[PDB]
Amino acid sequence: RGKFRSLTLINWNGFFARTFDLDELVTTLSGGNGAGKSTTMAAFVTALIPDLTLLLHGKLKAGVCYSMLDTINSRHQRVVVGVRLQQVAGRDRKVDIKPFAIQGLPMSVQPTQLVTETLNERQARVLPLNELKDKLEAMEGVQFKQFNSITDYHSLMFDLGIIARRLRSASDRSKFYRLIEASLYGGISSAITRSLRDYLLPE
């Protein structure tokens, strides 16, 4: 079976850089109902089903934002899957989201460091997708792909052993979305662990 490594939020309202491993994710999603829990679920659900028709603006902060799922499939391959989110001009509504996938990323690279730049004198800065791309190109063996089709994002995820079922249409996504939701709401810890286990990183 696969291994869920972490959920990483970059520049979300309340979390400039926050990584949650399995235990912390489950604990956070199961506990108190406040803004933290709610912002974390949005990030989790948005990385899994990046479909603006199924779900955001006030949950993010101005500029580049990321929500990433760091994983290891049953083949023992590390796969990072995520989305770059952006509040558009003519705000308080428009949010642009682009899904991406990274293969072959060395363990020495953590998601937060991956997507940020902290120059000696400087303060942390989030890289836009174009800079991330160039940065990963430079790394031997790393394969990066952005998607314009949610269906393509999901196809790769299925091929890479990240998601147990194939999501071919918007209907498929609605159904999956409802499944995830039924398991993420309710404050029952074991239901969360159970859904991540049976819906993600199969075989």
Side-chain angles (χ1 to χ4, degrees):
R1 224 156 181 182
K3 241 292 204 137
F4 181 89
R5 299 192 81 232
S6 77
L7 197 228
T8 295
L9 312 211
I10 297 305
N11 206 16
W12 282 68
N13 178 24
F15 308 88
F16 181 65
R18 181 73 148 84
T19 290
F20 306 80
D21 64 37
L22 231 192
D23 298 306
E24 304 163 70
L25 220 218
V26 182
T27 258
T28 296
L29 270 16
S30 271
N33 242 143
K37 176 186 146 147
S38 164
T39 287
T40 292
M41 208 191 71
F44 178 76
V45 173
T46 304
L48 245 208
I49 315 160
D51 188 337
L52 300 174
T53 300
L54 294 176
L55 33 71
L56 212 225
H57 178 93
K59 244 110 200 190
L60 306 167
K61 305 242 98 260
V64 180
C65 316
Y66 281 97
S67 177
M68 287 171 289
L69 291 188
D70 193 359
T71 236
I72 296 181
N73 66 21
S74 64
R75 247 121 64 185
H76 284 266
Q77 278 151 22
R78 188 214 184 169
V79 173
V80 178
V81 123
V83 286
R84 185 271 292 130
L85 326 290
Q86 231 152 208
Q87 284 169 348
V88 192
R91 263 169 70 278
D92 224 28
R93 213 171 172 170
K94 242 217 198 303
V95 170
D96 168 58
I97 290 121
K98 187 146 198 199
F100 67 85
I102 308 156
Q103 281 170 266
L105 186 71
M107 287 291 187
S108 65
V109 189
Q110 304 174 119
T112 285
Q113 272 70 23
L114 200 228
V115 125
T116 61
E117 218 200 305
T118 29
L119 286 235
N120 245 45
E121 176 256 22
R122 230 44 153 195
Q123 146 199 277
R125 163 186 166 263
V126 186
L127 300 170
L129 251 192
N130 53 107
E131 288 177 44
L132 179 65
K133 188 257 191 36
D134 297 340
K135 185 199 180 147
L136 296 165
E137 307 299 49
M139 302 182 195
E140 181 154 322
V142 178
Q143 284 183 264
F144 168 78
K145 17 209 81 128
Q146 317 184 6
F147 299 93
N148 267 110
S149 142
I150 312 191
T151 1
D152 284 351
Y153 172 59
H154 283 142
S155 274
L156 182 50
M157 277 185 54
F158 185 72
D159 297 329
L160 298 192
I162 313 324
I163 197 189
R165 59 176 61 183
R166 336 173 75 116
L167 304 188
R168 312 243 200 60
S169 62
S171 163
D172 288 19
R173 294 194 294 275
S174 273
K175 183 164 317 134
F176 189 58
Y177 188 92
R178 301 200 151 283
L179 282 181
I180 287 304
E181 270 194 319
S183 75
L184 292 196
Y185 286 114
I188 306 170
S189 182
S190 64
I192 296 176
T193 296
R194 173 70 226 137
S195 70
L196 294 182
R197 176 120 110 240
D198 69 15
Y199 285 139
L200 306 194
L201 317 147
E203 181 185 44

